[PDB]
Amino acid sequence: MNTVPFTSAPIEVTIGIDQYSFNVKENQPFHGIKDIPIGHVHVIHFQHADNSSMRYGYWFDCRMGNFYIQYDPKDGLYKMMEERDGAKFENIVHNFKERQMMVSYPKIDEDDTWYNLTEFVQMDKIRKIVRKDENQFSYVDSSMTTVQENELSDPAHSLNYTVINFKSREAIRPGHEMEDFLDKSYYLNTVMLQGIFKNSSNYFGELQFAFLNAMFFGNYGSSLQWHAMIELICSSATVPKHMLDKLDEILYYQIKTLPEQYSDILLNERVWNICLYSSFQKNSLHNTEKIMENKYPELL
Amino acid sequence: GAMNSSNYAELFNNDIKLFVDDTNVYRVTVHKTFEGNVATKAINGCIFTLNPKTGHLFLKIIHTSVWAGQKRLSQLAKWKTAEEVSALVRSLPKEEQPKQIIVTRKAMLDPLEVHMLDFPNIAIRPTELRLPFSAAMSIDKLSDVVMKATEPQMVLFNIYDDWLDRISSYTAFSRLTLLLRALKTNEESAKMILLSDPTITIKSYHLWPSFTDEQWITIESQMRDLILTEYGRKYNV
Numbered sequence: 001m002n003t004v005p006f007t008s009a010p011i012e013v014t015i016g017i018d019q020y021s022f023n024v025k026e027n028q029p030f031h032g033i034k035d036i037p038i039g040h041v042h043v044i045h046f047q048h049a050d051n052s053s054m055r056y057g058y059w060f061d062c063r064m065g066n067f068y069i070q071y072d073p074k075d076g077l078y079k080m081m082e083e084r085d086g087a088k089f090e091n092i093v094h095n096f097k098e099r100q101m102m103v104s105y106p107k108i109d110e111d112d113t114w115y116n117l118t119e120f121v122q123m124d125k126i127r128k129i130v131r132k133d134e135n136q137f138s139y140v141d142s143s144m145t146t147v148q149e150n151e152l153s154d155p156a157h158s159l160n161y162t163v164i165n166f167k168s169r170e171a172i173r174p175g176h177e178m179e180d181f182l183d184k185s186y187y188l189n190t191v192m193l194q195g196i197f198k199n200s201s202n203y204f205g206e207l208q209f210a211f212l213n214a215m216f217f218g219n220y221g222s223s224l225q226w227h228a229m230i231e232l233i234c235s236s237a238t239v240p241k242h243m244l245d246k247l248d249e250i251l252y253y254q255i256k257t258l259p260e261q262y263s264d265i266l267l268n269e270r271v272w273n274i275c276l277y278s279s280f281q282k283n284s285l286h287n288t289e290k291i292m293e294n295k296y297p298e299l300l
Numbered sequence: 301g302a303m304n305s306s307n308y309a310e311l312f313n314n315d316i317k318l319f320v321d322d323t324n325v326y327r328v329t330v331h332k333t334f335e336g337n338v339a340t341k342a343i344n345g346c347i348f349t350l351n352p353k354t355g356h357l358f359l360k361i362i363h364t365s366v367w368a369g370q371k372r373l374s375q376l377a378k379w380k381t382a383e384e385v386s387a388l389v390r391s392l393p394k395e396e397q398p399k400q401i402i403v404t405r406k407a408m409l410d411p412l413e414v415h416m417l418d419f420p421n422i423a424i425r426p427t428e429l430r431l432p433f434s435a436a437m438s439i440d441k442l443s444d445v446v447m448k449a450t451e452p453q454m455v456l457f458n459i460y461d462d463w464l465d466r467i468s469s470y471t472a473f474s475r476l477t478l479l480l481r482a483l484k485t486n487e488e489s490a491k492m493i494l495l496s497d498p499t500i501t502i503k504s505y506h507l508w509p510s511f512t513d514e515q516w517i518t519i520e521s522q523m524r525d526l527i528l529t530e531y532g533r534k535y536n537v
């Protein structure tokens with residue numbers, strides 16, 4: 001198990017760790033989070049009590065270094081930092097544990113939720129989407145735009161998601177205009193899977209990574225990316241049987257985890273009705289269709 | 301965006317534009333089979349592509365053979381339309397290519413947009429106007445070339461005859477849509493009007509009769525009467 005210590009908590013803040021969250025009061029004696037499962041990426045995220053504007057946070061993998069959080073009173077936020085001195089870090093962590101000033105990552109032993117939401121997310125691949133090569137962890141916030149949103153303005157602070165556009169020359173082979181636009185299998189399988197993602201693991205990973213940014217930060221461009229990646233599969237007649245089965249599981253856990261009260265803004269009526277009822281794959285997403293119909297029948 | 305009563309004069313500025321109408325591309329008769337079922341038989345069709353400023357009509361004739369062995373023909377017809385309009389633009393010299401293409405039915409937007417990805421600077425627009433170009437097949441000479449075609453064929457017409465020698469393209473388009481609206485509401489009466497007086501003929505190289513300015517005022521008024529009427533006979537007023 002690993003630990004993310006905090007130098008202190010000078011400002012009142014709601015702290016998230018993966019799908020968990022807890023409130024810390026101004027100058028309360030909080031020194032971090034312990035018992036974090038090794039073997040998974042993680043995200044630690046923040047919403048200030050004084051300004052619910054700007055949810056922000058850090059994707060990280062404990063296997064890649066010793067990370068801690070320290071408030072910066074100039075920039076006004078909790079920053080992730082790396083400690084290179086390993087002895088200094090065990091010493092600090094052990095002292096904070098002995099004084100029991102850390103919250104425990106509160107995993108129920110039956111629960112595979114986080115694994116199911118992050119199966120194909122990779123920290124090295126994530127570093128390419130949120131470009132900042134000097135850090136091993138990646139910052140995201142509610143306001144960051146995507147490269148395609150910038151095409152439609154700071155590229156250093158952008159989410160470099162794979163750009164999907166159904167009315168583009170990349171999507172449409174000269175002479176197959178009608179075929180390719182109504183059955184997107186060419187774009188999915190040849191253009192995207194074979195020749196950019198390289199395999200469906202990278203494809204599911206970005207789709208998983210998009211969703212989590214949409215849910216945890218309300219990042220609108222991420223939501224756009226998540227729905228686009230769903231729609232491309234759903235609008236393809238020819239999809240590997242194994243990809244459909246996994247997609248159903250992926251989406252099922254995303255729908256299960258979404259806050260019931262955020263459905264109105266994180267779910268696109270048109271994509272979901274298309275995918276579940278009109279598309280080629282309308283009869284291939286049994287688990288997802290069942291939870292959608294029992295949880296958000298209003299959207300449909 | 302869309303075209304409507306507020307930006308109507310944009311049609312007659314000096315930016316090349318074309319209207320495209322696909323309502324006569326896929327045409328059928330419905331009939332009973334010997335077993336008492338219903339079947340369709342397609343007949344020849346046409347794409348109606350018109351420069352509203354100049355009157356140049358690019359009439360692409362759609363021969364029934366293009367449907368053979370095909371499924372979902374009403375959907376294919378929209379993509380066949382977009383394919384032929386794209387081919388036409390590509391065949392024109394650059395300085396003759398349109399800057400805007402206005403489709404008369406919104407269902408044509410995505411088919412045409414996709415067929416024209418190579419021309420990102422050509423704007424594809426819908427329209428809120430209810431234009432009567434479906435009545436083009438009530439113009440005898442256009443109906444005649446479509447029905448006689450034995451192969452795919454493009455035929456060029458000026459739908460304004462020589463009117464631009466005497467009137468503006470705003471007025472020429474107004475006359476055209478009034479004629480076509482009348483032909484659409486009651487084809488019989490409309491044609492009776494246009495041809496009653498046997499001393500006014502249609503020149504071999506024209507579509508409409510050789511009316512004087514004064515005779516056109518009479519004709520135009522008679523067509524408005526017809527349209528109000530039918531609108532009464534229809535709505536009882």
Ligand SMILES: NC(=O)CSCC(=O)Nc1ccc(F)cc1
Pocket residue numbers: 120121122123125126128129162196197198201202203205206209
């Ligand atoms: N050519 C490239 O390197 C882009 S290939 C996309 C890719 O690997 N996307 C991804 C994003 C976040 C993840 F957590 C996992 C995968």
